[PDB]
Structure formats: C-alpha cells, structure tokens
C-alpha cells in the first residue's frame, strides 16, 4: 500500500555527472564514453558559432570528482556543446538519447558544480515547460527514465522562465517548447492538465482503496472532451483510452466510467475530501508509472 | 525557483542492496563492509509470525542456511547474530562499494529518502517523514522488507530506517539500523494499529517560510500570537504542539524573510480557520508537513524573492 511521487534510482546517472567551466561560467556536464555533453551557453544576442571559434580545447575545464579531464576536441549540436575528452567514462551505463512527448514523466538529478544534490520526479507539461526545482548553477542537470538496465536520457536543463518554471532540451540539443537560449523576453504559454495522467492516478486511488468518487454513470468520448475543454484539460484520445485498458480490467471500471467520475469532480470539486492525500487532481503519474508502482518493477 | 519533494541521490545506497533468503522467505539486506543487515523475520514462516520465538528459531540455523545474493554473485555467510529486531550476517567479502556511513536514530518530524527494493534490486526512490505516531506513509509492497531510509548531507550516508511491516491502515513500521522499532510496534502478526496521527507543525511553518522565499505572501496577516495561544488553537486541528525548540530552529528562516516565528504562527492559525479559498501555496491545496526547517534551507535560495 501507499502511493508516492517516485523517481528512478539515480546511481547510473550520478556516475556520469561532471563540472564544466569556461571562463567565469560553471555548470554541469554529462560524461558518456569519451564525450561530455553540456548547454552551449557555458561559452557566453549570442552568435554561438562566433563565440565557439574563439575557444580552444584548453579553455574548457572539466572536473570529474577530484580529477581533471583533458578536452581534446569540441563541437556544437543544436543547443548542446559536445566536448571530446581523452578518457572514456568507466562508469558509462547502457544508454539511449530519447525525445519525450508532453505528458511523459521522468526523473531529474539536480546537480551543482558537477555534484548531485537531489532527485525528483516530474512531467513534461503540455506547454513544454517543467515545474522543477532549480537554482542558478543547476544548468546541465539531466532528466531520464530507466528501461530494464538502459538509461534513456530525455532532458538537459538550460533556463528558468519568469513564472519560476523551467525550460530545456533533449540530449541532441533541441528545445522542448518555443524557447531560445538567450536573455530575451520569453514566457510559458497557458498550460493544461494532462487528462490521461489524472485518470491513471484515479485508477491508482481505486487500487489503494479510495473509491468515494466512483459513480454508476458512464460517458462518451466526445461528451467527455466537450467538458474537459471547458476546464483546461488536454483532449482524451482513443490512444489514451487504449493505454488505460489494463487498469480498467484490474479495477473493473471502464475508462469512460472513470471519465464520468472525473467530470463530476471537475463540476463539483472534492467537497472537503482528498484522493491519495491530495485536494487537487494529480497529473504527473502516467498509466505506466501507476502499473510500475503497483507491481514493484526493479532496475 | 520551484519547490519539490526532493530525495537524496540513491547511488551510494544502491551499491549496498542485496537479496537475503532463508528457506522460503526472500527479502532485502544492506551490505556494509563485511556485514549484511536485514529484518530478523526472514527466519520466520507465515505461521511463526503470531508468536515467534526468534531466539529459538535462530539457534536452529547455521551459516549455510542464509543465502545472500549481490547482483549475480553469491556471498558466503561466515557468522550470524541478532541485535534487537535486526539480523546481522557476517560475510567473507567486504562490499567494495561501501560508502562513508553512520547509523542514526531519528525523531518524529524528521524526513528521509527511501530506496524501495524487491529481491535485492532497487525499484524507486521517494521522500518520507517519520510521522508523530512513529509510522511512515510509504509505498511498499510485499517483498520490500529490508528496504532502507537515509539522508546524505555531505558525502556521508546516515541510515535511519529499515522497513519491517505494513499496518492495517496501509502505513508502515520499521526499525533504526540497530534493530530498535520506532513506536510501540513489534515484529509479530498480533493486532497492532497506528495511533491517531497529527500534523508536524514545525514542518508546516518551515514550508510557509519556503513559500515566502519563493515569492508568495497572500496568507500573511497583521496579527501575532503568544506560543501558548497558538498551541491551544493548533491542538484543536490535530497539530503537534510547537515547542520553544521549534521556535529556536525556525530562527534562521525568520531572519531571512523578516517574519517573526510567532507572526508566521498567526498566519498558520488563520489558514486553519479559513482554508485556502481556491488558492494554493507552492502548488498545494493542503498544508504540507513533510519538509523540515533544514530541508527548506537546503533546497531554497538564500535570497528571498
Ligand atoms: O535561466 C537561467 N539560469 C537559471 C536556470 N535554472 C534556474 C535558475 C534560477 C535562478 C536564476 C537563474 C536560473 C542560469 C542561466 C540563465 O540565467 C539563462 C539566461 C538566458 C538564457 C539561458 Cl539558456 C539561461
Ligand atoms: O507487514 C508485512 N509485510 C509487508 C511489508 N510492507 C508492505 C506490505 C504490503 C502488503 C502486505 C505485506 C507487506 C511483509 C511481512 C509482513 O506480513 C509482516 C507481518 C507481521 C509482522 C511483520 Cl514484522 C511483518
Ligand atoms: Cl478539483
Ligand atoms: Cl556500524
Ligand atoms: Cl532527528
């Protein structure tokens, strides 16, 4: 029993975190094989090709623990700088670089000066930002998922927006969201609630014995989406209904039967009650996260 | 900016998790140097659990009855002893991944990270607090016994909890790493229940100071309170009494924000009376009590917004 916001074990990622320094800027890098990946803004309206051409290998100081790595090459890929080093990381895990979609969750290993400080779970919001917990010096911290023994790196931290939310790239340097890596007026767009995730969390509550919100009613996909659009909820697709199939079979509550429960919660509120210790509808657990936590999958 | 329920990086603890098997029972062990620590109920069957005589069950076991697996490697047990509700298995290999560590017993209200494990394999990490009724609100399934709670301030891991059981309300009970249970619990299948739980007042105040640091002040008021009047009100909402020690501990946060502890107490009194009226504090519609004053200082900026 119990249901917590759970992150993946961070050990395989901790063994990859390094400190990158260029002039006065210090941030975090990810050391995989003989390459250190970090935000390109470590070098400085920026013309990154012009700033980079003026740098030599010895201008980049890379520290792994109490050991200085020597940079033997450098290149830029989108908004990420790739620093070739002479030493392959002996702690390099089995890994892939994957780009995630809004609604997907991942673990973040927040780092300062190449040293991991904490791990938390979060979701890529529909507006492509993350509601993270980052201070200055956290740039280069990464987001990941673990599948069997393979680490899938999906996020690298670059900046904080004026509302306190965060923006970054995948490990190929492509931003999530209409953001740019420069000091200019940028803002998070209007956000929405991840509907399939709220439904998954309602199924996690039922499995754990919280059933007060269930009702005898069902709905159609179209009627549910007309209601959900009114409350700034993301549209629910047939793919989402299909993905919730296993949870629907385990609890005996059809997906549109759970949608009718959700419609009632949106129109009436919780009336002083809580679901899994929360007075708000939680949207940062995916259907797979619910299945994994209620089954004990290990890595 | 931002405020998340943050766990310590689990790598130093992952390298210590092993699987312990005795007969038909399998659970998790913590391998530090040449000793594997695990719940003593690994020697019990389901029937034994009503009134187990652990001394009588243990005397019938030999070293070779304990199977310890670290990854895909079998460790050899060369000795065994019981210390309170923990079994200590001496092995013939020191763990090369043993971090710098201490065993610490914590008090109610303290927080810690939990590395939940099944078959000696880590599955996830989350943040917890020792409730005032000495239970923890964890996420544990059968097979998670032996999973541990810890903190990693600096490079040293302080082990504070080892998981032993789930109570009928779905909450969890366990011991420190010397095998002493937190609370009035026993490792017996006897009728046991969590006592009435309360809210950790000093932690809610710490979290209100975190909200002020992150730029929010909507909940503040022009009032103050005496400590005694605050406690008379707090007890009516099932909040733990706030002591002079708690007021002292909140001193640094009070100095950073410019809000006296007793002025923050008046704000808490008003929130209890009025609710949030559709508003949130750090993204929550409930008052959060699983962040300590120390956690707030560790996570938040030193410069208030
Ligand atoms: O947003 C930024 N940083 C920051 C990142 N994360 C948290 C912060 C908290 C507080 C202050 C800054 C934070 C660090 C670099 C930064 O100022 C910047 C500026 C322009 C473009 C880019 Cl890509 C990055
Ligand atoms: O509570 C217990 N366990 C469990 C531990 N954690 C989560 C569980 C979830 C679901 C079922 C059991 C869980 C495993 C051993 C257990 O049945 C037991 C019984 C009596 C005393 C003791 Cl010390 C331990
Ligand atoms: Cl609601
Ligand atoms: Cl010791
Ligand atoms: Cl303590």
XYZ file of C-alpha atoms and ligand atoms in Angstrom:
655
model
C 0.000 0.000 0.000
C 0.861 3.698 -0.364
C 1.369 5.888 -3.440
C 4.283 8.268 -3.682
C 5.787 10.502 -6.358
C 8.633 8.101 -7.062
C 11.794 8.713 -9.044
C 14.012 6.075 -10.703
C 17.173 5.097 -8.732
C 19.786 7.748 -9.779
C 23.070 5.807 -9.351
C 23.654 5.080 -13.073
C 23.317 8.854 -13.803
C 25.337 10.034 -10.741
C 28.420 8.264 -12.169
C 28.150 10.495 -15.302
C 27.912 13.966 -13.684
C 30.875 16.313 -14.170
C 31.612 20.063 -13.694
C 32.271 22.165 -16.813
C 33.938 25.604 -16.555
C 34.583 28.112 -19.308
C 35.921 31.448 -18.101
C 33.638 32.670 -15.342
C 30.708 30.269 -16.084
C 30.464 26.971 -14.225
C 27.699 24.389 -14.885
C 27.088 20.587 -15.116
C 28.005 18.141 -17.878
C 27.049 14.541 -18.703
C 30.091 12.313 -19.353
C 29.242 9.282 -21.517
C 32.096 7.308 -23.165
C 34.693 9.982 -24.272
C 32.226 12.915 -24.669
C 30.922 15.477 -22.119
C 27.529 16.977 -23.085
C 26.540 20.384 -21.668
C 24.435 23.518 -22.539
C 26.177 25.626 -25.226
C 25.523 28.790 -23.166
C 28.550 27.804 -20.960
C 30.628 29.823 -23.535
C 28.533 33.078 -23.183
C 22.023 38.171 -28.616
C 24.707 35.454 -28.879
C 26.337 34.153 -32.073
C 27.415 30.757 -30.728
C 29.499 29.847 -33.819
C 31.430 33.151 -33.433
C 31.927 32.653 -29.666
C 32.949 28.979 -30.098
C 35.526 29.563 -32.883
C 37.477 31.817 -30.430
C 37.818 28.944 -27.916
C 40.456 26.275 -27.746
C 40.243 22.852 -26.058
C 42.267 24.052 -23.010
C 39.706 26.845 -22.339
C 37.209 24.140 -21.167
C 37.914 22.832 -17.648
C 36.153 19.520 -16.959
C 36.291 18.083 -13.457
C 35.081 14.538 -12.625
C 35.261 14.185 -8.826
C 38.777 15.317 -7.884
C 40.193 14.516 -11.363
C 40.713 16.949 -14.226
C 39.732 15.536 -17.635
C 41.575 16.893 -20.679
C 39.422 18.229 -23.508
C 40.830 17.066 -26.912
C 38.018 18.341 -29.190
C 34.753 20.305 -29.256
C 31.694 20.646 -31.455
C 28.176 22.037 -31.224
C 24.943 20.147 -31.985
C 21.888 22.448 -31.818
C 21.908 23.958 -28.235
C 24.353 21.348 -26.773
C 28.140 21.528 -26.682
C 29.977 18.186 -27.074
C 33.431 18.122 -25.505
C 35.612 15.267 -26.604
C 37.816 14.109 -23.677
C 40.820 11.685 -23.679
C 39.297 9.346 -21.046
C 36.212 7.204 -21.612
C 33.942 7.206 -18.521
C 34.425 3.766 -16.933
C 31.030 4.216 -15.235
C 29.168 4.773 -18.575
C 25.895 2.813 -18.296
C 23.936 1.242 -21.193
C 22.096 4.324 -22.587
C 19.983 5.935 -25.336
C 19.062 9.555 -26.099
C 15.250 9.774 -26.419
C 12.937 12.727 -27.087
C 9.750 12.587 -24.953
C 6.233 13.966 -25.580
C 4.213 16.331 -23.307
C 2.549 14.277 -20.555
C 5.518 11.911 -20.205
C 7.257 11.782 -16.839
C 10.961 11.486 -15.968
C 13.370 11.711 -13.043
C 15.634 14.722 -12.628
C 19.005 14.520 -10.902
C 19.578 18.161 -9.839
C 23.370 18.977 -9.720
C 25.567 21.907 -8.676
C 29.292 22.006 -9.520
C 29.127 18.500 -11.037
C 27.839 17.113 -7.723
C 24.336 15.571 -7.477
C 22.207 17.166 -4.763
C 18.762 15.617 -5.198
C 16.407 13.540 -7.286
C 12.766 14.266 -8.054
C 10.065 13.109 -10.452
C 8.322 15.479 -12.876
C 6.392 15.646 -16.148
C 6.854 17.478 -19.429
C 3.885 19.914 -19.265
C 1.632 20.353 -22.370
C 3.228 23.888 -22.698
C 6.674 22.144 -22.870
C 7.937 23.530 -19.556
C 8.729 21.506 -16.418
C 7.749 22.564 -12.887
C 11.182 21.786 -11.498
C 13.230 22.888 -8.536
C 16.379 24.552 -9.792
C 18.634 27.388 -8.670
C 21.497 29.130 -10.542
C 24.252 26.555 -11.202
C 21.777 23.742 -11.988
C 22.211 24.084 -15.812
C 23.317 20.828 -17.382
C 21.319 18.721 -14.821
C 19.529 15.875 -16.662
C 16.191 14.071 -16.860
C 15.946 10.350 -17.545
C 13.944 7.127 -17.413
C 15.274 3.588 -16.929
C 14.007 0.656 -19.015
C 15.431 -2.660 -17.719
C 19.176 -1.755 -17.378
C 19.193 1.066 -20.055
C 19.148 4.746 -19.089
C 17.130 6.842 -21.570
C 18.321 10.486 -21.267
C 15.450 12.788 -22.264
C 16.188 16.246 -20.808
C 19.027 18.659 -20.090
C 18.296 21.799 -18.074
C 19.046 25.220 -19.697
C 16.921 28.006 -18.103
C 14.258 29.367 -15.735
C 11.313 31.375 -17.132
C 9.810 34.419 -15.277
C 6.977 32.368 -13.688
C 9.562 30.105 -11.947
C 9.061 27.128 -14.323
C 11.900 25.581 -16.372
C 12.964 25.011 -19.962
C 15.495 22.711 -21.567
C 16.464 20.469 -24.484
C 16.669 16.765 -25.357
C 20.321 15.367 -25.441
C 20.595 16.235 -29.143
C 20.167 19.960 -28.130
C 16.638 20.511 -29.497
C 14.475 22.575 -27.102
C 11.215 21.310 -25.718
C 8.955 24.311 -26.404
C 9.264 27.548 -28.436
C 12.224 28.665 -26.351
C 15.667 30.058 -27.259
C 18.921 30.033 -25.249
C 19.421 33.770 -24.850
C 18.420 36.534 -22.434
C 15.275 37.945 -24.126
C 11.520 38.197 -23.304
C 10.169 34.624 -23.200
C 7.181 33.220 -21.321
C 5.438 29.921 -20.638
C 2.243 29.593 -22.634
C -1.116 28.797 -20.979
C -0.810 25.304 -19.503
C -3.355 22.490 -19.433
C -3.952 19.411 -17.232
C -2.735 16.013 -18.521
C -6.100 14.155 -18.629
C -4.803 10.589 -19.267
C -2.470 11.037 -16.229
C -5.310 12.214 -13.928
C -7.326 9.124 -14.975
C -4.284 6.871 -14.267
C -3.995 8.463 -10.771
C -7.733 7.916 -10.116
C -7.136 4.204 -11.002
C -4.130 4.228 -8.515
C -6.522 5.605 -5.827
C -9.099 2.854 -6.527
C -6.386 0.141 -6.310
C -5.316 1.631 -2.943
C -8.902 1.643 -1.529
C -10.060 5.256 -2.201
C -13.464 4.756 -4.009
C -15.695 7.646 -2.816
C -15.541 9.375 -6.256
C -16.876 6.402 -8.239
C -20.421 6.660 -9.613
C -22.869 4.495 -11.633
C -22.507 6.688 -14.740
C -20.558 6.390 -17.956
C -19.997 8.937 -20.776
C -18.923 9.126 -24.432
C -15.506 10.235 -25.585
C -16.960 13.286 -27.394
C -19.093 14.453 -24.392
C -16.119 13.973 -22.058
C -13.870 16.071 -24.360
C -16.505 18.864 -24.558
C -16.470 19.031 -20.723
C -12.669 18.623 -20.421
C -12.056 21.520 -22.940
C -14.072 23.812 -20.617
C -11.755 23.039 -17.626
C -8.361 23.476 -19.489
C -7.821 19.705 -19.643
C -5.984 18.144 -22.569
C -8.249 16.226 -25.026
C -8.510 12.478 -24.312
C -7.858 10.375 -27.429
C -8.723 6.736 -28.316
C -4.981 6.032 -27.804
C -5.308 7.253 -24.191
C -8.404 5.034 -23.700
C -6.460 2.035 -25.114
C -3.407 2.724 -22.873
C -5.720 2.761 -19.791
C -7.103 -0.713 -20.776
C -5.050 -2.766 -18.282
C -6.012 -0.508 -15.306
C -9.692 -0.680 -16.472
C -9.533 -4.509 -16.391
C -7.827 -4.684 -12.947
C -10.356 -2.419 -11.190
C -13.488 -3.292 -13.198
C -14.113 0.383 -14.048
C -14.380 1.207 -17.779
C -12.324 4.233 -18.961
C -15.477 6.260 -19.875
C -16.939 5.125 -16.447
C -13.813 6.790 -14.821
C -14.314 9.837 -17.156
C -17.848 10.237 -15.701
C -16.251 10.266 -12.200
C -13.722 12.934 -13.412
C -16.476 15.087 -14.981
C -18.282 15.067 -11.614
C -15.047 16.045 -9.794
C -14.483 18.924 -12.247
C -18.075 20.217 -11.928
C -18.464 19.750 -8.111
C -14.998 19.669 -6.605
C -13.892 17.292 -3.824
C -16.239 18.709 -1.097
C -13.652 18.620 1.675
C -12.418 15.158 0.696
C -8.999 14.036 -0.585
C -7.789 11.348 -3.016
C -4.453 9.718 -2.103
C -3.826 12.572 0.372
C -4.331 15.327 -2.234
C -7.080 18.022 -2.532
C -6.101 18.655 -6.213
C -6.321 16.217 -9.143
C -2.729 14.923 -9.697
C -1.496 14.769 -13.343
C 2.195 13.825 -13.035
C 1.790 9.980 -12.976
C 1.390 8.214 -16.325
C -0.566 4.937 -16.780
C 2.819 3.090 -16.941
C 4.034 4.790 -13.698
C 0.837 3.564 -11.967
C 1.334 -0.025 -13.211
C 5.050 0.041 -12.272
C 4.480 1.349 -8.701
C 1.579 -1.010 -8.046
C 3.698 -4.038 -9.317
C 7.247 -3.394 -7.974
C 9.378 -3.302 -11.172
C 13.159 -3.186 -10.374
C 16.372 -1.872 -12.089
C 12.791 28.819 -8.125
C 10.335 25.987 -7.541
C 9.853 23.657 -4.599
C 9.725 19.891 -4.973
C 9.599 16.919 -2.602
C 13.237 16.043 -3.231
C 15.056 12.825 -2.360
C 18.828 12.375 -1.936
C 20.614 10.744 -4.911
C 20.364 6.976 -4.233
C 23.586 5.655 -5.865
C 25.554 5.265 -2.605
C 22.712 3.105 -1.172
C 22.010 1.147 -4.421
C 25.541 -0.299 -4.243
C 24.678 -1.804 -0.809
C 21.388 -3.591 -1.659
C 21.451 -7.394 -1.583
C 18.881 -10.236 -1.553
C 18.656 -12.411 1.602
C 16.947 -15.832 1.509
C 16.247 -18.243 4.341
C 14.170 -21.250 3.308
C 11.086 -19.955 1.518
C 11.397 -16.282 2.672
C 13.198 -13.762 0.486
C 13.748 -10.046 1.411
C 16.358 -7.218 1.124
C 19.591 -6.716 3.056
C 22.047 -3.828 3.448
C 25.668 -4.860 2.800
C 28.170 -2.544 4.517
C 31.817 -3.699 4.888
C 31.589 -7.495 5.701
C 28.083 -7.436 7.326
C 24.604 -7.772 5.759
C 21.831 -6.205 7.897
C 18.230 -7.418 7.440
C 14.895 -7.817 9.364
C 15.062 -10.818 11.732
C 11.656 -12.043 10.431
C 13.485 -13.507 7.397
C 13.882 -16.680 9.623
C 10.065 -16.932 10.160
C 7.326 -18.635 8.170
C 3.759 -17.106 7.938
C 2.596 -19.307 10.881
C 5.625 -18.336 13.050
C 4.584 -14.659 12.868
C 1.776 -14.835 15.519
C 4.128 -15.503 18.497
C 7.634 -16.136 17.085
C 10.431 -17.015 19.500
C 13.265 -15.585 17.426
C 15.998 -16.910 19.770
C 14.570 -20.446 19.396
C 14.225 -20.125 15.580
C 17.753 -18.660 15.156
C 19.575 -21.302 17.274
C 18.309 -23.948 14.754
C 20.028 -22.158 11.842
C 23.552 -22.477 10.545
C 25.536 -20.004 8.372
C 24.878 -22.027 5.171
C 21.071 -21.761 5.689
C 21.336 -17.999 4.755
C 21.662 -17.320 1.007
C 22.924 -13.802 0.209
C 22.976 -12.643 -3.406
C 24.715 -9.393 -4.504
C 23.947 -8.881 -8.187
C 24.717 -12.212 -9.859
C 27.224 -13.229 -7.129
C 26.588 -15.446 -4.108
C 28.195 -14.160 -0.894
C 29.255 -16.737 1.748
C 27.814 -16.268 5.262
C 30.540 -16.914 7.911
C 28.649 -15.765 11.040
C 25.290 -14.514 12.325
C 23.949 -12.644 15.295
C 20.750 -10.918 16.282
C 20.668 -7.352 17.614
C 17.118 -6.378 18.682
C 14.884 -6.867 15.528
C 17.797 -6.973 13.047
C 19.784 -9.973 11.920
C 23.493 -9.295 11.187
C 25.071 -11.736 8.749
C 28.877 -11.755 8.613
C 30.058 -12.428 5.044
C 33.511 -13.360 3.560
C 33.693 -10.300 1.242
C 33.741 -6.640 2.263
C 31.476 -4.547 -0.017
C 33.858 -2.591 -2.283
C 31.056 -0.075 -2.851
C 30.634 0.657 0.927
C 30.203 4.439 1.247
C 31.187 6.624 4.239
C 28.256 5.928 6.629
C 26.694 6.271 10.105
C 23.668 4.669 11.781
C 21.428 7.437 13.210
C 18.109 7.128 15.126
C 15.704 9.923 14.068
C 12.847 11.705 15.889
C 9.231 12.201 14.654
C 9.065 15.033 12.154
C 12.449 14.216 10.600
C 12.498 13.431 6.873
C 14.498 10.877 4.881
C 14.764 9.259 1.452
C 13.596 5.682 0.919
C 15.110 3.380 -1.690
C 12.309 0.809 -2.208
C 13.759 -2.638 -3.264
C 12.460 -6.085 -4.265
C 14.758 -9.147 -4.475
C 17.809 -7.026 -3.670
C 17.068 -4.776 -6.685
C 16.192 -1.067 -6.284
C 12.919 -0.021 -7.877
C 12.441 3.595 -6.849
C 13.306 6.465 -4.561
C 10.951 8.769 -2.679
C 10.950 11.258 0.213
C 9.257 10.372 3.587
C 8.833 11.770 7.123
C 8.678 9.879 10.431
C 5.080 10.695 11.498
C 4.383 11.830 15.108
C 2.683 8.374 15.634
C 6.062 6.772 14.569
C 4.732 5.298 11.317
C 5.791 6.323 7.790
C 3.386 6.843 4.866
C 5.403 4.824 2.366
C 4.795 2.972 -0.864
C 5.781 -0.600 -0.130
C 4.522 -3.930 -1.497
C 5.200 -7.478 -0.111
C 8.928 -8.231 -0.690
C 10.037 -4.660 0.200
C 11.153 -5.643 3.754
C 14.751 -4.682 4.348
C 14.448 -1.518 2.113
C 16.141 1.430 3.873
C 15.678 5.114 4.678
C 18.615 7.510 4.724
C 19.988 11.049 4.404
C 23.200 12.096 2.591
C 24.194 15.519 3.942
C 27.814 15.936 2.521
C 29.493 12.599 1.347
C 28.253 10.527 4.331
C 25.145 8.315 4.252
C 23.197 8.301 7.536
C 20.998 5.147 7.609
C 17.948 5.845 9.791
C 15.280 3.297 8.843
C 14.825 -0.324 7.753
C 11.370 -1.455 6.582
C 9.674 -4.336 8.518
C 5.840 -4.167 8.125
C 2.611 -2.638 6.914
C -0.125 -1.845 9.462
C -3.889 -2.356 8.683
C -4.407 1.316 7.674
C -1.771 0.995 4.903
C 1.003 2.843 6.803
C 4.465 1.388 7.521
C 6.541 0.477 10.566
C 10.211 -0.375 10.931
C 13.399 -0.002 12.945
C 16.610 2.037 13.108
C 19.776 0.105 11.897
C 20.400 -1.175 15.446
C 17.017 -3.047 15.209
C 15.012 -0.873 17.631
C 11.494 -0.243 16.367
C 10.212 3.282 16.009
C 6.983 3.495 18.049
C 5.191 0.838 20.082
C 5.384 -1.816 17.375
C 6.577 -5.426 17.427
C 7.635 -7.777 14.599
C 4.665 -10.105 15.396
C 1.356 -10.578 13.447
C -0.513 -9.507 16.624
C -3.331 -6.895 16.473
C -1.422 -3.619 16.186
C -2.648 -0.263 14.951
C -1.278 3.183 14.270
C -2.190 5.701 16.970
C -4.087 8.893 15.968
C -1.744 10.877 13.731
C -1.085 14.601 13.937
C 0.332 17.298 11.628
C 4.035 18.237 12.084
C 3.599 21.931 12.986
C 7.284 22.999 12.814
C 7.419 21.492 9.246
C 4.262 23.339 8.087
C 5.833 26.614 9.392
C 9.103 25.803 7.540
C 7.080 25.233 4.321
C 5.215 28.568 4.786
C 8.680 30.248 5.080
C 9.697 28.426 1.826
C 6.604 29.903 0.111
C 7.647 33.443 1.303
C 11.213 32.833 -0.035
C 9.771 31.744 -3.398
C 7.710 35.000 -3.643
C 4.286 34.308 -2.092
C 2.752 36.240 0.829
C -1.053 36.066 0.323
C -1.529 34.107 3.625
C 0.254 36.575 5.903
C -1.785 38.779 8.275
C -1.157 41.784 10.574
C -1.504 39.646 13.738
C 0.808 37.905 16.184
C 0.165 35.235 18.856
C 1.679 34.023 22.099
C 3.151 30.443 21.862
C 0.522 29.199 24.353
C -2.481 30.655 22.423
C -1.077 29.167 19.175
C -0.807 25.708 20.819
C -4.363 25.914 22.225
C -5.662 26.609 18.683
C -3.282 24.072 16.964
C -4.304 21.169 19.183
C -7.942 21.666 18.001
C -6.871 20.830 14.394
C -4.752 17.812 15.437
C -1.484 19.722 15.046
C 1.529 18.770 17.151
C 2.411 21.229 19.941
C 5.038 23.804 18.899
C 7.857 23.982 21.464
C 10.479 26.674 22.217
C 12.979 24.313 20.488
C 10.870 24.522 17.310
C 10.743 28.360 17.579
C 14.561 28.424 18.003
C 15.099 26.077 14.997
C 12.966 28.420 12.817
C 15.220 31.406 13.743
C 17.327 31.420 10.534
C 14.223 31.322 8.233
C 12.620 34.072 10.312
C 15.786 36.270 9.810
C 15.941 35.626 6.039
C 12.281 36.608 5.406
C 11.848 39.251 8.132
C 8.767 37.443 9.548
C 8.870 36.605 13.286
C 8.082 32.934 14.176
C 5.045 33.970 16.216
C 3.840 36.194 13.299
C 4.094 33.114 10.996
C 2.205 31.160 13.711
C -0.643 33.734 13.493
C -0.745 33.153 9.716
C -0.977 29.367 10.275
C -3.842 29.918 12.773
C -5.770 31.917 10.140
C -5.185 29.336 7.366
C -6.549 26.617 9.677
C -9.629 28.770 10.308
C -10.311 29.897 6.723
C -8.876 27.265 4.413
C -7.178 28.396 1.164
C -10.263 29.818 -0.654
C -9.306 28.384 -4.054
C -5.653 29.414 -3.681
C -2.532 27.262 -3.455
C 0.797 27.605 -1.665
C 3.746 26.197 -3.619
C 1.342 24.279 -5.873
C -0.508 22.579 -2.993
C -4.131 22.995 -1.753
C -3.246 21.337 1.625
C -0.712 22.476 4.252
C 2.478 20.394 3.625
C 4.239 18.877 6.683
C 6.959 16.646 5.187
C 9.683 19.379 4.746
C 11.797 20.231 7.785
C 13.411 23.636 8.504
C 16.768 22.019 7.419
C 15.202 20.754 4.086
C 13.860 24.256 3.337
C 17.288 25.862 3.887
C 18.940 23.103 1.738
C 16.534 23.466 -1.234
C 15.511 27.155 -1.261
C 17.619 30.098 -2.418
C 19.443 32.118 0.260
C 17.917 35.284 -1.339
C 14.131 35.806 -0.761
C 12.047 36.926 -3.806
O 17.813 30.960 -16.739
C 18.995 30.908 -16.456
N 19.549 30.186 -15.439
C 18.815 29.509 -14.412
C 18.446 28.172 -14.528
N 17.740 27.483 -13.620
C 17.375 28.123 -12.516
C 17.677 29.482 -12.248
C 17.265 30.150 -11.066
C 17.574 31.467 -10.869
C 18.298 32.175 -11.821
C 18.714 31.570 -12.972
C 18.419 30.204 -13.228
C 21.024 30.222 -15.441
C 21.375 30.856 -16.784
C 20.127 31.697 -17.142
O 20.204 32.967 -16.497
C 19.900 31.829 -18.649
C 19.670 33.073 -19.228
C 19.421 33.185 -20.587
C 19.385 32.054 -21.388
C 19.630 30.824 -20.809
Cl 19.562 29.390 -21.799
C 19.895 30.694 -19.457
O 3.636 -6.478 7.053
C 4.268 -7.335 6.466
N 4.827 -7.211 5.229
C 4.646 -6.093 4.350
C 5.515 -5.007 4.342
N 5.379 -3.912 3.577
C 4.336 -3.865 2.758
C 3.366 -4.891 2.647
C 2.258 -4.816 1.764
C 1.344 -5.830 1.706
C 1.481 -6.953 2.516
C 2.536 -7.067 3.379
C 3.519 -6.043 3.473
C 5.629 -8.385 4.845
C 5.752 -9.177 6.144
C 4.504 -8.777 6.955
O 3.378 -9.536 6.524
C 4.702 -8.845 8.471
C 3.712 -9.355 9.310
C 3.848 -9.293 10.691
C 4.979 -8.720 11.256
C 5.973 -8.248 10.416
Cl 7.396 -7.522 11.111
C 5.856 -8.310 9.038
Cl -10.961 19.859 -8.197
Cl 28.396 0.194 12.499
Cl 16.163 13.587 14.118
